[PDB]
Every structure is written in structure tokens, then in C-alpha cells.
């Protein structure tokens, strides 16, 4: 079945977040092929357990601990996939479904071993970066970003102050303006994501674009 229920919901919410979708209960229900009311029952208990808040707008907001797990689940999932693909040679059409069971039972140590053995752990076979490899072994953007991805709102871009200007069009093409509710992250390497499009910001631009919490 789902193997680990809470972890299913956690990885679901991450993945909605990566696609730029608002992690709504109905969205999660749909993705998991579960019922809405079954979904609220689980969300209730994830709340209790400290993994989630149900925000004003009804969006599931992962607590930092919640987001840490979700990231860990996701990293296991993606590495099981690389493992299944690169090494085992499992039919690509079953790799995901399999990794959907293995994500819940892979130890940290096995993950660490997989980093050693595989050729490249930058992305899953399905083209998505693998997160949390570090964990394993108004307000300026440069200052509002952390290690973990938050949706925030663009409050000003300040193109007047910029020497380097080729990213003006990259933002525009990403419909990043005004704004304009985008996910920001970190590493300095800040990324603005908008639905679900990435603009890797050069430092001058990150230092000058300002955000506000939603």
C-alpha cells in the first residue's frame, strides 16, 4: 500500500512545492488517490505530530521538522530510483513505483553508500534534483533565502541599480515581476522559482531584489 502514510503526504507536499503548485489538501488527495476526508484525517494527525500547519489560505505549511523529513524521504526516493536504474537495471516503467516502496525503508547509511557507488547523484532518472545531500554527509532576497525553499512575494526588482542586465529577460520570461509569488532558496546561489521555472540569480540581482512574506 502507501508503506508509510505520513511520509507519502510529506513527499507529495514537497513535490507539489517543486512543481510550483499550492499544496492544497484537495491536490494531495488527488495525487495520492485518496479521499478528501481521509486526507483531513491524516493532516489532523500530522498537525498533532508537528509536521504541518494548515494556514489561513488552507495551504499545508510544513514545519521545519516536517520539511526536513520530506526532504529526507525525497532524497531516499530519488537515490532508490538512480539505484534501480543505473545499477539494478529495473524496467524504467517500474522504477518509480518500486522507489515509492523503497523510499520508506532505506537507512541513511545505505544512502551514503549509494553516493559512493553511483556515477552521479545530482538528479533522479526523472530529471529532478536530489535534495538534502548536505544533511546526509522590503527585505533583500540575499537575506530572506535559507537552505530550505519558501514561497514569498516580489516587492521590488530595482532594475535601475543593475550593471548586469541579461537576467532582466530571464525574469520576465519566468513571469517574475511586481510581483509575484515565487519560491526562493540558497547556497551565494539563490534561485527564484515560478511555476515551476528556475532563474539562478547572480549576486548583484539577489542583493537588490526585495521580498515580503505572503
Which residues would be at the binding site for its own copies (CB under 8 A)? 3, 84, 87-91, 94, 98, 101-102, 104-105, 107, 109-110, 113-114, 116-117
- Shortest distance (Å) from residue 90 CB to its own copies: 6
Q: Give which of Ni ion, its own copies, none residue 90 binds (C-beta under 5 to 8 Å, depending on kind).
A: its own copies
Nearer to its own copies (CB atom), residue 90 or residue 155: 90
98 binds, among its own copies, Ni ion, none (CB under 5 to 8 A by kind): its own copies
Shortest distance, position 22 Cβ to Ni ion, whole Å: 21
Please tell me what DSSP assigns to residue 59.
B
Q: Tell me 130's DSSP state.
A: P
Distance from C-alpha of 206 to C-alpha of 138, rounded to nearest angstrom: 13
Which residue lies nearer to Ni ion by CB, 81 or 171?
81
Residue 130 in contact with residue 121, Cβ under 8 Å? yes
Closer CB to Ni ion, 1 or 166, in the complex: 1
Measured from the CB of residue 109, what is the shortest distance to its own copies in angstroms?
Answer: 6
> Is residue 14 within 8 Å of residue 70, measured between CB atoms?
yes
Burial, 194: exposed, middle or buried (Cβ in 10 Å; 0-12, 13-18, 19+)? buried
Site string for Ni ion, 63-102 (x = CB under 5 A): ---------------------------------x---x--
Q: Which helix (H) or strand (E) holds 10?
A: helix 5-18
Based on the shown chain and the rule CB under 5 A, indicate whether residue 15 belongs to the binding site for Ni ion: no
Burial class (CB in 10 A: 0-12, 13-18, 19+), 71: buried
Which helix (H) or strand (E) is 71 found in, with range? Answer: helix 64-82
Closer residue to Ni ion, CB minimum distance, 3 or 26: 3
CB 164 → Ni ion: shortest distance, Å?
37
CA pair distance 185, 31, nearest whole angstrom: 25
- 3-21 exposure pattern, b = at least 16 Cβ within 10 A, e = fewer: eebbbbbbbbbbbbbbeee
- Phi then psi for 96, rounded to 5 degrees? -60, -50
Shortest distance, CB of residue 81 to Ni ion, whole angstroms? Answer: 6
Between 3 and 214, whose beta carbon lies closer to its own copies?
3
Residue closer to its own copies by CB (options 104, 151) is 104
Q: How far is the CB of 102 from its own copies (least distance, A)?
A: 6
Amino acid at each position: 500500500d502507501l508503506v508509510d502514510t505520513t511520509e507519502a503526504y510529506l513527499r507529495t507536499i514537497y513535490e507539489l512545492e517543486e512543481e510550483g503548485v499550492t499544496p492544497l489538501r484537495a491536490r494531495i488527495a488527488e495525487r495520492l488517490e485518496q479521499s478528501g476526508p481521509t486526507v483531513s484525517q491524516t493532516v489532523a494527525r500530522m498537525e498533532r505530530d508537528g509536521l504541518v500547519v494548515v494556514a489561513s489560505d488552507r495551504s499545508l505549511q510544513m514545519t521545519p521538522t516536517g520539511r526536513t523529513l520530506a526532504t529526507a524521504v525525497m532524497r531516499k526516493h530519488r537515490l532508490a530510483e538512480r539505484l534501480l536504474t543505473d545499477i539494478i537495471g529495473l524496467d524504467i516503467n517500474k522504477v518509480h513505483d518500486e522507489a515509492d516502496r523503497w523510499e520508506h525503508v532505506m537507512s541513511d547509511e545505505v544512502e551514503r553508500r549509494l553516493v559512493k557507488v553511483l556515477k552521479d547523484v545530482s538528479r533522479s532518472p526523472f530529471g529532478n534534483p536530489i535534495p538534502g545531500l548536505d544533511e546526509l554527509g522590503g527585505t533583500r532576497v540575499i537575506d530572506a533565502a535559507t537552505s530550505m525553499p519558501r514561497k514569498v512575494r516580489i516587492v521590488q526588482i530595482n532594475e535601475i541599480f543593475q550593471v548586469e542586465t541579461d537576467q532582466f529577460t530571464q525574469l520576465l520570461d519566468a513571469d517574475i515581476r511586481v510581483g509575484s509569488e515565487v519560491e526562493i532558496v540558497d547556497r551565494g546561489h539563490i534561485t527564484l522559482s515560478h511555476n515551476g521555472k528556475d532563474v539562478e540569480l547572480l549576486d548583484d540581482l539577489a542583493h537588490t531584489i526585495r521580498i515580503e512574506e505572503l
